[model samples]
Target chain A: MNGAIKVGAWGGNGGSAFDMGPAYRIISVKIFSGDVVDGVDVTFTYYGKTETRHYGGSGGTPHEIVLQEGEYLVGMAGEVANYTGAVVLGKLGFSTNKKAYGPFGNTGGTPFSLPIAAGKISGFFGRGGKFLDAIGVYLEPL
Target chain B: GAIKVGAWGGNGGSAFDMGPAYRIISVKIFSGDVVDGVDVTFTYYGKTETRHYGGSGGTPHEIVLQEGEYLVGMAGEVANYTGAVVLGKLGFSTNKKAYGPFGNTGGTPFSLPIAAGKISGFFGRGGKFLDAIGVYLEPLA
Candidate 1:
């Protein structure tokens, strides 16, 4: 589950959703691979602060961080070989000489996959914060 | 014998004899040992500001100090000493060579006793001694 929720009045199929107020908290996050296989940079922006954390090398491991409220909208994006990846809130496994990065993901749940084919991607994105019974409103006993 | 001195007024007011007075222009100090070398300088207090004078003495020497404000030479080069060295105003005397009250005993006029203490200078002129690697100058107490 990605770690971001846009807060604001929304007009849709139904009458409307909760009037999402000002963003004041961060919940979770995921990374979508971008261009550039090497010399990539993964940075986090939160609490009015932007930090370029990693650069160079195959890439990085997935980071499952427990950011309290105010951790800011968190996400990851970069393209590197298999050697770079981190498993956060999930288990990760992979192999490569320089061509691909995992079939990796958060074990207990739906593991999100990133792009491997040159110029193509197959990652995941999750967003949608409900204010009322926000998360409960979309619940159905499957 | 302590000399009796008195004060007097003059110029814009009372015209009396003020008495005896001495002035010092400057004072310099330095200290250190011989592993390397130290050079303490002497101060020359002119009517306006003060000036510094360095010494060539390898060890000790004496100097005629003045009365006004003056700095005492404590030890050798206070800035350039790498090893250990002790400095104090004391007199020195070897069976053959004597480094007197001033750090300089060899043979110099304006040297001070190897030991510490005061030396008076009149009108900004006189011998000012320093430690082997140090020097000092103060208004003669």
Candidate 2:
């Protein structure tokens, strides 16, 4: 329970993964739009621990990390098909453990455990070109 | 400041249309789940307005009309494909103007005489029988 604790503005057009649970210290990571050229890999698992970090694209901004904690996964690698480059909206910055909950939006399957308390962070939109059209995350405690 | 706004959230196959630079009564809706059934049709010039509602899946509601340049269509209910539906709070009271709460999922497009403030856009409709669809517009008084 310290400084910056912002998570996700998640969106996709190809590769996907998101699960930022408890325990934190990730300083900076931002990707909402620079208009495509994907590459993201931020994985930190606990209990037998694991860690990873990599962020790439055009509209560059927050890029700083080197704080520790575990249980978080965001992986959407580079691609090409219908020009897979233009929609990889993800924003994350960390420092947790007071009343943990989510930064959860990967409703395609496989989300084991990552629950914290207090809530209010909701978003979603989709019409044609249908997919899971998502954006959701929550964690509140001043 | 007339009243012009546009929104589209997707998941029921596909269809799109929006126009009403000014003169709009009401159109505020949201649906992500509520069983399933979203069929909205509004076209003016020769008179055409259709409405079928059943989606509070995400909880947002409104639909009242009487103005020109109204041609909107949204669809869902292909064997209960309930997921997305969102339109904005577009209401104009003459000089008592208000636009948006505009959400479609973050890209913000659909410009207009609507230049009061606030903008947001989002888009999705992935595989495996997904659900979610959207539309929004406003002006009254």
Candidate 3:
């Protein structure tokens, strides 16, 4: 509540409900995945001026992250898989405040992690089509 | 708050302090080829500690800081060996993030620039490898 809060939506619910606000400085996170995710993009800055965005459908193969000026993302883990009858997103990983990244996509499924603890994701909500399927986060307190 | 910033790196061994802290959660960097050693994990007034200064031989890397996070500055790299001057590489800056300069990657950089405050732990001078480093800020109200 110090300017943002919202967490989890996980997977499923098909498209609509994207929302990526509250941002102030993130810089990059481009995941595309090969066997499942297929899309998700971000590159931010809201008070320093810079922008880039995306949500689903473009189909796998990207994986990039950036962040260097004080870095962020406080921890998030993923996996969900079941595609075809629903329940999407599968494998993703990130942890910052200093070090950890990529669960990337492709790898078993049904995991999920986030115990966050204190601020710093700053915007992202889920449910996307053509391949993303569901997710969440929007923390900010840094 | 008080203020006692820096121990940057390689000023030559013999000192060490693991004093101030109220929160630091975790930090453990070992590094390879040069740096070698660190392990913090703070919480003071109520007593919660985990300390280690230098020399174990590199390769650890563990940063975890979430309760409200702290740390504020740091940077690394230093060399000279045969005459003393060690440390090599290490990086950690936080108020939000930046963790690692870790060991191995050229040398002679050096850092610690608080500008206001928030480090709260670490002090320098080691025997096997660390050899020099600093920090212990905590100002800003």
Candidate 4:
């Protein structure tokens, strides 16, 4: 509870929110693409509070994890499939928590709508479900 | 943000996530009954995210300032009114994000299973939506 925003990740869109708080170390990222997948969501749950956005969807959804005021961001990925579509697709993702995230100049401030960096995200907890592939969380020196 | 100040409004029948954050402080606590409120709770679905709203269709929605009051109904009520549950809830509506009904739908001055503040008002025509009789507080503190 150190004023950190707990982040969670889902495999794809149109699914449930699973508990992904235990793992804080994300080293890489891999996203689900192609097919009849609705979309994906990456949320930053902070101070037990949360702000989330579906990946590749609405502009208002939280797209960035901004670290400020000594706040930390923790993230996990969850995924869902289109049960009605009969396609059985898969999803993947990653995240981090820090004031001033991204080293190579990502925007700052609330409603962070900046494009995230592409680096190797480190520090993680338990990996659940499955991993079709591994995506990297491009990290830079703070 | 501070506590929500109550007002009259309509919410989608779709069951909203309400609060998905893991913060103990951000957990939303619901009080009062789901029916009889000066407001209605609904949820919308995108591909990934779920949103919730509190208020009437024409009137301005409300926020819980002091102690927030809410209503509780049955999941059965959702189907009875041709409404649906999105977020594993009854009173709350959803748009096919998960299982259950697709979303919540009702007309103006319609029947809503709700509870209100210290005052009583006319109950809408539709059957009650929420299965449980209770309230909700976002970001549990």
lDDT of each: 0.23, 0.30, 0.70, 0.25
Candidate 2's residue-wise lDDT over A1-142, tens digit each? 2321222223444434443434543333333222222333344445656665444432333333333354222222111112233333322222243222222222122111112222212111111122222223322232
Worst 10 residues of 1 chain B by lDDT: B1-10
User: How well docked is model 1, in DockQ terms?
Assistant: 0.00
> Which of the numbered candidates is closest to the native, going by highest TM-score?
3
Candidate 3: residue A46 lDDT (0-100): 76
Error of 2 at A102 (Å): 22
User: Which has the higher TM-score value, candidate number 1 or candidate number 2?
Assistant: 2
How far is each candidate from the true structure, as Cα RMSD in Å? 33.5, 18.5, 15.3, 16.2
Tell me the DockQ of each model, to 2 decimals: 0.00, 0.02, 0.03, 0.03
**Model 3 chain B lowest lDDT segment of ten:** B1-10
Query: lDDT of candidate 1?
Result: 0.23
Kindly provide the TM-score of model 1 when superposed on the true structure, using C-alpha atoms: 0.15
Question: Relative to the unseen true structure, what is the C-alpha lDDT of residue B66 in candidate 3, on a scale of 0 to 100?
Answer: 83
lDDT of 3 at A87: 71
lDDT of 3 by residue, B1-141 (tens): 232333545656567777777778988888786776788988788988898887777688988888677766676766665566776777887778787778775555544434334666777788778877666554444
lDDT of 3 by residue, A8-125 (tens): 5667777776877564566898889887886788888777788888888888899887878788887777777887676788777788877888878884455655534344676677
TM-score of 3: 0.29
- By the DockQ metric, which is better: model 2 or model 3? 3
Residue A117 local lDDT, model 2: 20
Off by over 4 Å in 4: A1-28, A36-80, A83-142, B1-90, B93-141
lDDT of 4 at A81: 39
Instruction: Tell me, by lDDT, which candidate is best.
Output: 3
**Clashing pairs in model 3, backbone N/Cα/C closer than 3 A:** A38-A60, A123-A138, B7-B133, B7-B134, B31-B58, B31-B59
